[PDB]
Design an enzyme around this catalytic site. Structure first.
Site, short mmCIF file in Angstrom:
data_model
loop_
_atom_site.label_atom_id
_atom_site.label_comp_id
_atom_site.label_asym_id
_atom_site.label_seq_id
_atom_site.Cartn_x
_atom_site.Cartn_y
_atom_site.Cartn_z
N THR A 10 0.85 -1.18 0.00
CA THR A 10 0.00 0.00 0.00
C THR A 10 0.89 1.24 0.00
O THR A 10 2.11 1.14 0.11
CB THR A 10 -0.99 -0.01 1.18
OG1 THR A 10 -0.29 0.05 2.44
CG2 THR A 10 -1.84 -1.29 1.12
N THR A 20 3.44 -0.91 4.52
CA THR A 20 2.65 0.22 5.03
C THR A 20 3.57 1.42 5.16
O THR A 20 4.60 1.35 5.83
CB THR A 20 2.01 -0.08 6.42
OG1 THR A 20 1.15 -1.22 6.33
CG2 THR A 20 1.18 1.12 6.89
N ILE A 72 7.95 -1.49 6.65
CA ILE A 72 7.62 -0.08 6.79
C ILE A 72 8.21 0.64 5.61
O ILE A 72 9.43 0.57 5.37
CB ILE A 72 8.14 0.58 8.08
CG1 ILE A 72 7.66 -0.21 9.32
CG2 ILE A 72 7.65 2.04 8.14
CD1 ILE A 72 6.16 -0.21 9.55
N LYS A 73 7.34 1.35 4.89
CA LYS A 73 7.73 2.05 3.68
C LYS A 73 8.11 3.49 3.97
O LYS A 73 7.35 4.22 4.62
CB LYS A 73 6.58 2.03 2.66
CG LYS A 73 7.05 1.80 1.25
CD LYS A 73 6.01 1.06 0.41
CE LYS A 73 5.01 1.96 -0.19
NZ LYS A 73 4.41 1.35 -1.45
N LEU A 74 9.30 3.87 3.51
CA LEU A 74 9.84 5.23 3.67
C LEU A 74 10.34 5.72 2.30
O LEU A 74 10.99 4.96 1.57
CB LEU A 74 11.05 5.24 4.61
CG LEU A 74 11.02 4.60 5.99
CD1 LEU A 74 11.60 3.23 5.88
CD2 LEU A 74 11.86 5.37 6.98
#
Length: 316
Positions: free
Chosen positions: A33, A94, A130-132
């Site tokens: 996402t 996410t 965890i998307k950064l």
């Protein structure tokens, strides 16, 4: 056979959507996402339960309106991830609030916070990315987070500088972009038709993949953001590929096996000294496509964050 089935022989297929319907339809290994897809998913009537749960949960943390907005927006994105995790055996990606993209400490904190929410619902870290955004600051956040057992997906990756720095930070996964690079070239050059092998997003991801395998880096390469199935097939062999449902449908409806295009059959070469921040900034900013598209993607995701907060604010 069909091109989706054929692709899966070479590449791990990941669905790029917050729509749980797609997870049942395509049965991907992982799902991704981003703040735009959370905003879109939040607006589907069938997802009202997840919003309401998020808000009810937010309301049972603080009596502060500004804080409830934060808690509820975080929890909604995690709620969507939990529904997806019920239908996929691998990871959910996410993404943190994109307004934190140039702030290492705030990004580390926000990643820890999302991990906490996921852990509180009984999910281990080995099911979460965890998307950064892959700014220098996000890459530094990721290097620390991995050391603390939090796996990251470094996204909006456009320049070779970004790719190299992510590899050297030891990040679990990169999402180098394809379609938005094609957009930039059509918009900024005369040429508006490319054969698949000359699509500049395909070239970028292919180059990054070689540099990664060539130096034995363990970071997973996941091509992302597509305009056409031609781009995807040209990247068959990529460790993973995250694909929107529209393009998953076209692959599944296309007949005929495909060949593997992306491989490295060769020696693990010695690595350079690590790129310093100054060298990274020079090199990223040599690439006018990456200069534009990194900054733009962060801007657009920050706006989606604001809209999500406006929706949540209207429910408090």
């Amino acid at each position: 056979t069909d091109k989706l089935t054929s692709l899966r022989q070479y590449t791990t297929v990941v669905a790029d959507t917050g729509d749980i319907a797609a997870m049942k339809l395509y049965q991907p290994q992982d799902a991704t996402t981003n703040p735009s897809l959370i905003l879109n998913a939040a607006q589907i009537p069938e997802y009202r339960k997840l919003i309401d749960d998020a808000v009810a949960w937010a309301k049972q943390q603080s009596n502060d309106r500004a804080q409830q907005i934060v808690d509820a927006t975080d929890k909604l994105a995690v709620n969507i991830g939990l529904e997806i995790l019920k239908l996929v055996p691998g990871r959910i990606s996410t993404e943190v609030d994109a307004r934190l993209s140039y702030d290492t400490e705030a990004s580390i904190a926000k990643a820890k916070r999302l991990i906490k929410l996921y852990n509180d619902a009984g999910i281990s870290n080995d099911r979460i990315l965890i998307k950064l955004a892959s700014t220098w600051q996000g890459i530094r956040a990721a290097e620390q987070l991995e050391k603390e057992g939090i796996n990251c997906n470094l996204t909006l990756l456009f320049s070779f500088a970004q790719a190299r720095a992510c590899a050297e930070a030891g990040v679990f996964l990169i999402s180098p972009y394809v379609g938005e690079i094609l957009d930039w070239y059509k918009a900024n050059t005369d040429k508006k038709e490319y054969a698949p092998a000359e699509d500049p997003g395909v070239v970028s991801v292919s180059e990054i993949y070689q540099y990664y395998k060539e130096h034995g880096y363990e970071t997973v390469v996941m091509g992302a953001s597509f305009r056409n199935i031609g781009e995807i097939l040209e990247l068959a062999g990529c460790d993973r590929l995250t694909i929107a449902p529209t393009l998953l449908k076209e692959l599944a409806e296309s007949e005929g096996a495909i060949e593997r295009k992306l491989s490295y059959t060769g020696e693990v070469k010695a690595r350079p000294a690590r790129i310093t921040e100054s060298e990274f900034l020079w090199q990223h900013n040599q690439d006018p496509m990456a200069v534009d598209k990194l900054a733009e993607g962060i801007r657009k995701f920050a706006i989606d964050q604001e809209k999500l907060e406006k929706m949540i604010g209207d429910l408090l």
